[PDB]
C-alpha cells in the first residue's frame, strides 16, 4: 500500500527523534549532575548533544506546526528549516572537534607533561637548591664546581660539553631520565603496586612526582599512596595538598594533583583551545548556513526551499559538510594507525580513556559521515532509500549511548552514589 508505507516510516522517524531527545536530555543530565564528570571531554559531548537536541526540537516544531495559506508557503517553515540546517552542520563540526580532541589526546603523554613542568635549558645552570641542571630537568651533582659539573655532564652526554647542549641532545637525556624514573618505581616495594593499579594518565602523574622528587622521596607519601591504590582520588587530592611538596612548588603540585583527582590532562590544557572548538562547532556552520538561507530567500523561494534543484545554491551547504566529512575520515584513519601502534607497543591498555573514547568516536565517524561521501555530487528502490530516515532519526540515541550510557566513568558514579545510600 502507498499510504501505509509513508505512515509506517513516519512512526519510526518520530519515535527515532523521541528516543533520541529523551536519551540526550537524560545523558546530558548525567554529565552535568555528577561533579566528577566535569571535564573538557564531557563538555565537548554536551555541545554535541545540544546540536542533536536542537535538531530534534526542529523536527518536533515542524510536526507541531502541521496542526493549524499552507505551511509550505509560510515564513515560519523556512525559519524552522533554517534552524534545522544549522543543527545538521553543527552535528558535523562538533563531530569534527570530537575527532580533533581525540587526536590531540593521543598525542599528549608524560614526555609532553614533563617538558611543560620542567622547561628547557640550553646552558648549565646552578639552581636554587645548589644542584647544577640542564636540558629538561636533568639534575647533575650538588658539588659546587662548574668545572666538575661540565665534566660530569660530558660523561653523561658522550661528547665535550663546553656548556651549550643542543635541543636533540636534551631530548636524548630526557628519554634517559624518564626511563630511569619508571625503572625506579618498578624497583620500589611501595611504588610498584600503586603504579600497576593506576591508569596511564595517573601513572604519568606518579612518574611526574618521581621525576621531581625521587623514587625514595615520593615513597614517603605513605598516607597518599594507599588511598590512590584504593581508587579513592578525591581523598588523596586533599591529602597531597597538606604536603611539603605542595607548599614548596604550588603551581606544579596543583597540576599533578588534578591529574590524580580527575585522570585527565585538563590541568595542562590551554583555555583558548576549548573556545576554538566552540568557534568551530557553532561558529563555522553559521558561516555557510546563513548565505545559503539568504540566496534561497532572494533567488529560490518555493515551498520552504524544498525544491533545491536549480543552481550553485545546493553546493554552498553540501561542500562544507563534505569538507567536514573528508577530514573526519582522515582523522578516522590517522587515529587508527596511532591506536594500533600504542596498543602493539604496550603504550596503551584497552582500559584507558584514550582507547575507550577512540572506541566510540571511531564508530560515530563512519556512521555519520559515510552517506555524505558516497553520494557526494548526486542531487537525487524507493522503500530502500526511505531507510535513511530511520538512521538519521536514531542518530542522537546512538550518540547518547556511545558517549554516556556505556561510559565506564558514569557507571562508577551510579554505583558510588548507590554505595553512599547504603553506608
Ligand atoms: C554499535 C556497535 C555495534 C559498534 C560499536 C563498537 N564499535 C567499535 C568497537 C571496537 C573498536 N575497536 C577496537 N579496536 C580498535 C582499533 F582498531 F584499534 F582502532 C577499534 N572499534 C569500534 C563499540 C564497542 C564498544 C564501545 C564502548 O565501549 N564505548 C564506551 C567507551 C567510551 O565512550 O568511553 C563503543 C563502540 C558497538
Numbering used by the authors: 136 to 203, 218 to 257, 1001 to 1160, 261 to 372, 380 to 422
Which passages does the manuscript contain on this structure?
GLP-1R belongs to the class B family of G-protein-coupled receptors (GPCRs), a group characterized by a 120–160 residue folded extracellular domain (ECD) followed by a canonical transmembrane domain (TMD). We have previously described that ten thermal-stabilizing mutations were introduced in the TMD structure of GLP-1R in complex with two negative allosteric modulators (NAMs), PF-06372222 and NNC0640, and we showed that a di­sulfide bond (I3175.47bC—G3616.50bC) and a GCGR mimicking mutation C3476.36bF are indispensable for crystallization.
To study the effects of these sites we made further constructs in which we mutated back single point (C2333.36bM, named M9 hereafter), double points (C1932.63bS/C2333.36bM, named M8 hereafter) and quadruple points (C1932.63bS/C2333.36bM/A2714.47bS/F1962.66bI, named M6 hereafter). This finding indicated that these two cysteines may function independently to improve the monodispersity or thermal stability at that stage of construct optimization. Fig. 2(b) shows that compared with M10, the M9 and M8 constructs have similar and slightly lower melting temperatures, respectively, which is consistent with our finding that residues Cys1932.63b and Cys2333.36b are not di­sulfide linked.
